[PDB]
Design an enzyme around this catalytic site. Structure first.
Site, PDB file in Angstrom:
ATOM      1  N   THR A  72       0.846  -1.180   0.000  1.00 23.17           N
ATOM      2  CA  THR A  72       0.000   0.000   0.000  1.00 23.17           C
ATOM      3  C   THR A  72       0.882   1.229   0.000  1.00 23.17           C
ATOM      4  OG1 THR A  72      -1.626  -1.214   1.288  1.00 23.17           O
ATOM      5  CG2 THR A  72      -1.927   1.127   1.087  1.00 23.17           C
ATOM      6  N   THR A  73       0.571   2.204  -0.844  1.00 19.71           N
ATOM      7  CA  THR A  73       1.346   3.431  -0.950  1.00 19.71           C
ATOM      8  C   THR A  73       0.408   4.533  -1.398  1.00 19.71           C
ATOM      9  OG1 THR A  73       3.389   2.266  -1.467  1.00 19.71           O
ATOM     10  CG2 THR A  73       3.201   4.544  -2.076  1.00 19.71           C
ATOM     11  N   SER A 120       2.735   1.108   3.494  1.00 19.34           N
ATOM     12  CA  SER A 120       4.004   0.486   3.829  1.00 19.34           C
ATOM     13  C   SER A 120       5.148   1.026   2.997  1.00 19.34           C
ATOM     14  CB  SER A 120       3.926  -1.022   3.646  1.00 19.34           C
ATOM     15  OG  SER A 120       3.828  -1.351   2.278  1.00 19.34           O
ATOM     16  N   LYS A 153      -8.375   1.993  -3.742  1.00 22.42           N
ATOM     17  CA  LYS A 153      -8.026   2.600  -2.474  1.00 22.42           C
ATOM     18  C   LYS A 153      -8.133   4.113  -2.487  1.00 22.42           C
ATOM     19  CE  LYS A 153      -4.589  -0.947  -1.591  1.00 22.42           C
ATOM     20  NZ  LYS A 153      -3.172  -1.165  -1.215  1.00 22.42           N
ATOM     21  N   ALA A 193       4.861  -4.946  -1.119  1.00 24.85           N
ATOM     22  CA  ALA A 193       3.433  -4.826  -0.879  1.00 24.85           C
ATOM     23  C   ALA A 193       2.789  -3.693  -1.659  1.00 24.85           C
ATOM     24  CB  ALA A 193       3.168  -4.624   0.609  1.00 24.85           C
TER      25      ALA A 193
END
EC number: 3.4.25.1
Lengths: 221, 203, 221, 203, 221, 203, 221, 203, 221
Positions: free
Chosen positions: H1-2, H129, H33, H168
């Site tokens: 996730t970023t 992350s 997201k 991730a």
């Protein structure tokens, strides 16, 4: 249940009018015991006479007779049984019968205080022996308790309270005082009726109740 | 703790120790672990003392209220079923006991009930910490054709044989014989210690 | 529900007036059994006669007939079924029918005590065998229980209680006492009507209920 | 504990041990683990005793009340679905049991239900601690074209083959045969021990 | 809701007077099926006739028509749907329709027992097939259930019950009995009115409901 | 457990194992893990059995009550959103499942939902313990221009390739094809095992 | 709220008398859309005309007009907004407007069932597009829902329902049907009054609401 | 996730990954997201998926109901204050998320909110992350005098520089530009991948 | 609180009769501000004139005047303060005053819906600036909200609404419009009375309230 302008509770006296239609019942103290008698008016051949119960036990040492509306009577007998067993669980033994009568009569009082309920139309007699001795009590639909030596409830109340007011020598034996009580129950009636077999229960200090079978009842009759 | 129930032809014999300890320490040399919960029905407690006494007070109340409301004594399988429902509605804050219920309704019954309410009927049962020694005696000496005298002498042999190999069992022994004719009769002290002295045992 | 100035509960007698419009039903003890009969008044061709239920079972050993408002009757039959199964879960077996009748009649009493509810306009008969034997009970909208040998409820109550007052020898066999009961149910009617097939159920100690099919009903008719 | 359910053509055969233990210790040599919950429906319990008996009392009550309210017996998939909802509404204070429900509505059914309410139908099932030995017999000897006699002899072979390799299983064996014609018929003791004596086994 | 001095519940008969203003609706059993017909009185051009719903489904195997106050009808149809889905979650399948009707009629009874609520002014018909077969029921504002073969509710009730009392041979096929029912619905009217398209739904054992479109309705008309 | 959902042009293919185990032990060789929750919508369960069956009963009830109240079927994103709210209102006493919801509202959809209610739509998804082997087949062989025949043959290749490298997956395979024309059609046993026999695989 | 002896609920018709004092409002379906018009009776210079709101949105796809007691109207508009957002949180999108109208009208029904509350004195119109299409609904103080094509509420109801009964060709474009509706709103008045600027809102499938500013309103006037 | 939020002069640029994993395992290569919670306001979720989606549904409902009741959009500091009160009234059964709220009321705002409801406004923020790699790019290349074109190219450089050093994070990138003139405009796929192909990066 | 047969709520109009005995109060919008004036009728030397409060602040940007029963007025001012602080805790700032007025008027509506409570006998005016601007509101005992430009409450309501109907040019400065408002408050009286010092509060966008001291009040007088 509110007050009348002369300070009376009308639903309570109307409840006492509902009590004055019940069966005649006696309670009497023996020399070393107590006694309960109830007028068993057999109404048909079709009713089981062997299973109708007038004197019904709260405990092996505590019995009670009722008068008035029989459904409210059954409810307060069940409440007296449950309260007796709560006192046996909490303390260990039923030391005082007066507090069993006060736990019944606090509920009977409680329904003459609150709106939304009507008073109980019953009057009860609690008899039995305890750590003080042979004790007899009477409970009135306002929740009024009096401790007696010989009392009566029901339709023929005043004839029996009058007869036992003249009669009732204090320390009598069992058989003579049962004869006295059944003479009171004969004195309450008319001559157009005769006593069919009453129901009689007795207790003496040290023993449990002895509910009389029909041989002793017809023999005393 | 050592508790025995024996089903004979028309009798139930239930007998118990009288010793209460605290993990090595005989706090009370004279307890009471054999109770009469109904006219023809006796209960024998084992395990934790405080939970067991409260179960005794509940069962005396519920059985007596049943007897007043219905004019007949409760059947023994309904006593053990009632007590199984009482012990099993908790189950996770449990009563740390194990119980014997013995009585007579038409035939003699002995029910053994554990701490989670599993009631099982058996012809003889034994609870407590000295239960395996009792089971050792009752495997080799129990015959269901005994009289009540040989039954009482058997249970005295079993409990006296568990008093010597268990440190948490001791004291005077309480025997109670339940028949239809007389009912729950707890045998007197001098009769039981006369049987102990007569069989060649140590009290 | 409050007291009248002569000690009566008006909503309870008005409930009994609602009971006096129901169907006539009988209960009768056999030598070693009991019996329930109900007047099945077929009103049209368009109603399923095979699925109308007058005698409906509380238990395989306990049945009950009703009279009065049929909705309140269905409610109290469902309450009697649930209370019977609570006694089977708690104890293991239904030892006494009298306490099932007392658990129904304590609710029927309870609605004549509290304000905000009206009494049940039903009267019931509970029949069946238990550990004491073949037992018959009647429950009245005040919650009043009586144990009988032969009783009736509904509109034609007094004709059947009068007929069974003259009749009803005590220890009868099954077929003769069913004939007696259906003669009582004929005696309740007029001559402008005839009995269409009643509904009859019987039990003998050791067995479950045997609800009669129409061959035995028309054969007894 | 060793419990077997077998689905034949028009019969369900359910059989069980009769031994109740406590972690090495045969507390009761004679239990009851095979119950008739409805006219055509039998339940077989395994696991904890106290939870299982309470589930038996609930299921007898709910099935009988269903039968009175609707005049037809409950279908077996609704019995297992009802019991799955009962076991699964708790799930975190769970009943530590595993159960077999077998019966006949139109075709024979055997449902196996675990402690979290997962009901799975299968042609034969087995629960308890001696279940893998039963599965060993029923993999190699079960044929769905057997009669009821060879079915009963099969379940006696399976449970008798699990009594010898499991220490928590033993005692007399309870067989119950469910058909449409007679219904739930529990076979008598002398017939079953005559089959055990006739097949060359140890009771 | 209290008792009248002759034993009647006035709010319940006033609720039935509120039922007698509703639309006429029929229920009828086929040889191997059941049938619901409702009088769709179109009142203006401005109302969506395609979205008005008289026969509305409780389940794919259970439908129900209503009469009386339409808001209380919508409330009890939603309660019947939720109760049907509770029985499907609990047991797995809807075995009996009679107990769905009893779970509706126990609430409809419940509001004629308690003070502070008024009774429902609706009468319903529950039709559909289940494990016993094609079944038809009627529910009355006191909570009174009867199982019929052909019934009607609403304003024109007695004309249709009279017509089906003369008519209604029992085991009819689908089309002939729909013709019979729509002749009953013609017989309820006057000659000053004519039937605009009724709403008809039917079910046969093994299938789900088939709500008729207007081609079959006008074709049967 | 091995569950596959495939989104084609105008079809959803969902297929499953039929094996229920207990940590090495094949308790039931024939389960049911592929359900029809609505006319055009199928659900495939994985994880714990008892929670998953209760979720199936809730979703059948809520979808059918929705269909009766609104006369149109629920959109698939509202099915997965509803089920995400049901799984996520608990979250700390959670349902130990993972679920696939596949269906057709206007375009085919496959939603994959985990145990905390995170619904993600994807063109193909797979849950269970043998999910990575399915992902291995579907990375190298899935093309979104396949027909329904090559789709069904693909899912049979994927699940048959996960039956051989996962011990918790086995048994007969359940394939269900969802189209607009016929709807939810579960393929028969003999057609699927004819495809297994025709592709050269082991059942 | 109890029943009248002819089966009516007096508080509900008195609530409808409270509805007949409100402002006149129209709802009308377009060919591919719907429409709400409300009579904005400006009463003084001292009231902010720019901030008075007659058509107020439940949602970008659902609007509603009210008539009757304006406080109860504000309460039910807030309840409709909260219920719409609960359906968006639970499901994801507002698929059906009919169930929003049923969740409002189940509360409006609920206050005509229970004692201790009075009914809402409002009548509402719910208009807007959804997955079925352009939909129009009307809700009555008993909780009575009807789906219309063109309706009116308020004091001048019958003049507009009469005018749209004569008028209202079905599939009209936007501007012509707004002209028709404002001619209906002119037809409801007297000649002693003239229309000050009404308030008009419209929606077409694919778009959100377009509440008209005063240029289009005076231009259509 | 970023997840990235950038405050320019009169624009907010918010961009995100599209990859959902399970501890090494790319469960879904295509997630969502980046959400539009109001006309001029966007939210970007990170952390647990199931809690974050439920927070998105609550915030869409509360912001839209606010807009209907008050006829003006909610200020961004009240969005972050509302969401801080929602996350912090729980705090001990918490939502395991971290969130970005970016929008325009009079000046552009980016608020970063952690799992216990601590809302802090900053000129650029990043969660997930792979947030430290984004912070590495945005320390050395962010200037607040950039245009929107150099802003979008910057956020593509930052997220593409975090896709290569975080396992991730991956997949297609979602960019959304919020201005007063057009509002919330999510850039199309082919424009963004034309910028990725034009800057010399790997998708 | 039930409906009258012509659709009115009698307790609400009796509450408005309780409002018509209160003090006269004005609210007026400035060019870039708002204004509240209240008639401070000094009744004796013995009352602290410095501590009596007519304009009392809900917030530094929101004030409110009251009329009617002063105890209910104090209760609703405390409820408005607590609701304002709940909106400041939840959101961060008081963006809209209209929703504060709606949270007061939903409670004032709520007591005209339920039985067991009486309506509030108060009418309020809410003035102050927010993110939309200088805003003025009036709340009526049924919970009825209207947004004004200049209004009055109390006994002398109609004289001031009539005077400001003739007067009140819209965008006035502060001092001229205070002079206009105090001329309205002079126009409400008789000539047998004169204005003792009123109480005046004003706000301009960007600032907080400036409650005038007696120098500016007597200077404007």
């Amino acid at each position: 249940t509110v007050f009348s302008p002369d300070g009376r509770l009308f639903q309570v006296e109307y409840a006492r009018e509902a009590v004055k239609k019940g069966s005649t019942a006696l309670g009497m103290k023996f020399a070393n015991g107590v006694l309960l008698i109830s007028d068993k008016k057999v109404r048909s051949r079709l009713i089981e006479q062997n299973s109708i119960e007038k004197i019904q036990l709260i405990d092996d040492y505590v019995a009670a007779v009722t008068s008035g509306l029989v459904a409210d009577a059954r409810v307060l007998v069940d409440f007296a049984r449950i309260s007796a067993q709560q006192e046996k669980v909490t303390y260990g033994s039923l030391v005082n019968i007066e507090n069993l009568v006060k736990r019944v009569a606090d509920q009977m009082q409680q329904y003459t205080q609150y709106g939304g309920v009507r008073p109980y139309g019953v009057s009860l007699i609690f008899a039995g022996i305890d750590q003080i001795g042979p004790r007899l009590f009477d409970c009135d639909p306002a929740g009024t308790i009096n401790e007696y030596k010989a009392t009566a409830i029901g339709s023929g109340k005043d004839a029996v309270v009058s007869f036992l007011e003249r009669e009732y020598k204090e320390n009598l034996p069992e058989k003579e005082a049962v004869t006295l009580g059944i003479k009171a129950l004969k004195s309450s009636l008319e001559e157009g009726e005769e006593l069919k077999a009453p129901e009689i229960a007795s207790i003496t200090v040290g023993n449990k109740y002895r509910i009389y079978d029909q041989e002793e009842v017809k023999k005393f009759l | 703790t050592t508790t025995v129930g024996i089903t004979l032809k028309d009798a139930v014999i239930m007998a118990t120790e009288r010793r209460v300890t605290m993990e090595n320490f005989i706090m009370h040399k004279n307890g009471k672990k054999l109770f009469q919960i109904d006219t023809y029905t006796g209960m024998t407690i084992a395990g934790l003392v405080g939970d067991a006494q409260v179960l005794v007070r509940y069962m005396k109340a519920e059985l007596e209220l049943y007897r007043l409301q219905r004019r007949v004594n409760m059947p023994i399988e309904a006593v053990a079923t009632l007590l199984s429902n009482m012990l099993n509605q908790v189950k996770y804050m449990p009563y740390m006991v194990q119980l014997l219920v013995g009585g007579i309704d038409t035939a003699p019954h002995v029910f053994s009930i554990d701490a989670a309410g599993g009631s099982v009927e058996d012809i003889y049962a034994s609870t407590g910490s000295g239960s395996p020694f009792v089971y050792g005696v009752l495997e080799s000496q129990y015959s269901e054709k005994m009289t009540v005298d040989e039954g009482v002498d058997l249970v005295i042999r079993a409990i006296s044989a568990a008093k010597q190999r268990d440190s948490a069992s001791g004291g005077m022994i309480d025997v109670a014989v339940i028949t239809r004719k007389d009912g729950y009769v707890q045998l007197p002290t001098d009769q039981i210690e006369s049987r102990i002295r007569k069989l060649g045992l140590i009290l």
